[PDB]
Every structure is written in C-alpha cells, then in structure tokens.
Amino acid sequence: MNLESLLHWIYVAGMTIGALHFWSLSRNPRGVPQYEYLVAMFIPIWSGLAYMAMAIDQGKVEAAGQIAHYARYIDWMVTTPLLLLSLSWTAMQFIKKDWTLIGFLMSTQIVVITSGLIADLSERDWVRYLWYICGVCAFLIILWGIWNPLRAKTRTQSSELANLYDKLVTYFTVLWIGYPIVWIIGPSGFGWINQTIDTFLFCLLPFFSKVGFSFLDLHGLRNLNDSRQ
Template sequence: MDPVEIMKKTTSLLVPTSTSTVPGATNFPTVLPDKPIYEHATASGTRTLWVVFVIMLISAAAFTAMSWRIPVSKRLYHILTTLITIIAAISYFGMATKHGVNYNHTRKTESHKHVPDTHQEIYREVYWARYVDWSLTTPLLLLDLCFLAGISGAHIFMAVLADLVMILTGLFAAYGGERSGQKWGWYTIACIAFLVIIWHLVVNGRITAQAKGSKVGKFFAAISLYTILIWTAYPIIWGVADGSRILSVNQEIMAYAILDVLAKPVFGFWLLFTHAKLPETGVELGGFWTHGLGSEGRLRVGDDDEGA
C-alpha cells in the first residue's frame, strides 16, 4: 500500500477527546494525570537488610564473647563496639520488617506548550531507622577513636556534638522538598559538621595519639584514616540516592549495607584484635565502673564524728 494512503488512514483514526460537552465550546485534548510513582525496596533490597541484621547480630555476640576474656576494668572498647553492633542490628530489623520506614512525597512539574502543566507525584521510601541508628552508633565510634588517641574531654564533646548535627541535618535533608532547595541546604550543613569531625580526629587525635607512643600513633593514624574514608562515602551515596535519586532504593540499601558492615563489625574486630596486642592502647577504669557501690562507694554515717 502507498505510504501516503497509510498516513491518511492513520491520521483519520487520531481523534482528540474533548474535555467539554457544551456545544460550541472549544475542544482541547484530554490530559490524563500520571499515576503516582512509588520508589520502594523489592525482594532483593529486603533480603539485603536481613543479611546485614544477621551480620550485626553475630558480630555483637562475638564482641561479647571477646569481652569475657578480660577484666571488667579493661572492657571499655568491647562494650562500645558491642553496643554499636546491637543498635545496628535493631535498626536493620526495623528496616527489614518495614517498621522503620515511611515515604517522602515530592511533586515534579512538567510544562507543555499546548496543554496544561502536568504533575508527577513521587513517593520514595525513607529509612528513618537508619538515621536513629547513626545518631547513636557514630558517637560511640567516635568515642572508640577518641579514647584510643587520648583526646581531651572538651574536644570529644565538640566532635560528638558535630556528629549529632551531621546526622540530624541529614535526616532533615532526606525529607526536604525538591523545589525549595531546603534539601541541599540541610545537606550542606551536614557536610560542614562532618569537616569539624575530621578536624578533631586528624589534628587533635593525631597529636595526642603520637604522644602515647609510635605504635599507638601508627595504629590510630591507620584506623582513623580508614574511618574517615568510609564515612566520606556516606554523603556521596546520599547525594546520588536520597539527594538526586539517581540510585534506586535497592541500590541505596546495598550501598549503605556495605558501608555499615565496614564501619561497624570490621572496624570493631580490627580495633579489638589490635587492642589485645598493644597494651599501650588500654583504658583501665576502676571505681564505680568496676566495683559498683561497694566499699569504695558506700556512704558511711558517723565518719566525721569519729574523726572529731
């Protein structure tokens, strides 16, 4: 058949649908609204969450078993690393069971020449349990590093405070809108807070760790650099996942899963095994930490009278 005839027949079938039933009214093509888009985890993403939950649980059990081999007064690192993995396990359980998840709603508007603007409603899963996890575990990780280096209490306080600001503003950014730019404003504040953390670790931590000896200084330099590199990957993943939404929810879950395993169980095993070989890294706590309210903490009535 002649191509011209085919074109005529095809064109005759394309009849625009009127949006008005009033006689004489101007007819416009009907613009049907797009269905909402739901960006959520599928079976592979959920399976990843369960796998990391098991890894965190096994790591917590291993750290607990390792702590039984040493006196209570020397278990500070063991207790911190155990708490880190327990909190992470609870977080991943919440995310895997969909109890630590909700949707962030955004609207994408597209302009057209001959028809009204169209709006695309997008709902993307936000794992708020992840931010609760980070707000509790990252300060504990910082305490591990700060105690290892021997950083002063004032600098520890500032580093932990900057860490909390980083996590909370990251959570605000995850729920930020697309058009107002508030998402990237919160993201910028979080990155600035992260730079404050790096400054405390690199400058103050390096100086105090070297003062404890060359072995401690080298170990702190290695494990702090490892931590900084891992933590630097988090805002990058956020930028291409929750931020620009280049990564799917499944890809976001897998990326964060890898980082969390490296930042928590791997970090913990490295710290504890090296701590066992380097006596200089030890932190020994007595008093209430070790003995409780025993003879050292008991209030004895009448001591002043006897002294008189």
C-alpha cells in the first residue's frame, strides 16, 4: 500500500483491469442480458479514465478565489447514478417495458446527484447549505421508495432474487453512509482536513466501493450451487 501523491493514478489502473475482466465474460452472462453488460462498459470504463485526469491536474479549477470540485461531481455522476442503477440492472432478468413506478424512481436519484454538481458550482453560501440538504432529503426518500412498494414484478419474478436483493441494497446503502456522513461533519471529510488529505479519504472510499460492490453484484445473482447434496 502506497501513501504518496499518486492516488488518482493508481485508481484508473485498477479500474482498467476491472472493466476488462467483464469483456472476457461477454462470452455469456447468464442472469443479466446484454444491456446490463453494457452498463459495465458504461460506468466501469468512464469512471476509470476520469480518475486518470485528476492525476494530470485536469479537472478542478479556481472559481471565485476558491477551489471547485467539478471533475469530482461529473465523475460522481456516471459513477454514482449508474452505481445504484447497476445493482438493479444486475438483478434484472429480462425486459419488455419501461414501467412508470420504477421510471419515476430512477428520475429521482438522477435529479439529486445533479444538485451535487451545482452545490460545487454554487453562487452563494446560503444556497450551498440549502442545496446540500436538497440532495440528502430526496435520497432517504429513494431508498425507502424502492423497498416500500415491492410490486409483484419482483415478488413474482423470483423470491430468491428478492431475498439476496434486499441484502444488496443494504450493503450499498452503507456505502452512502460512508460519504453522506463524512460530508456533513468537517469540510468534505472528518474535520480540519486539507485539500490533499481530503481527496485521499475519498480515493480510498470510491475505490473500496466499486471493488466491493463489484464482487457483490455477481456473487448475489449466483455465487455457488449447494442444493443437490
């Protein structure tokens, strides 16, 4: 384990091998249609190149005598918005519609994260704290909105996938607990954190989220067969 100024670099590295492994699995998914595998190329690849930029010093710019984390939000979009969607996509067996219920939900998280970018691209302070609460609020409403209904779509699809799924959304919910909690106290960290040390607490954290949830998504759908004896 290293502890120097090369996090953003080593980050894109691990992400490169990740999205690659999936390419080898394209031979056949078994449990997740093509559109899902594509989801990987979508986020796993995009996220990768993103970090590589943070290393070259091309992402954050000085705006209003301050430091804005623009590159941090955009990457957090395709990464975060498609992170939660990836969990559901991986579970999804087949498709033949759009559905209004789920359709509305997906639009909820989409708007929340959007607020994030603005939070950094704000114009005043009073609006910063105001917007910050705008996201967290709609967030807790989303998670509770997915387990609350529980339409027959899932209850009929496969009880097995419905069970393991519950444990999934739970683990992912913890990932947020990691960021939404450090965000509140201290400046985007634990407290009295600098600009460098700050990006560190994170680099270690989305790196631990993508890697973990990765093996979790696949493990959930199918880990091992232990029925016949």
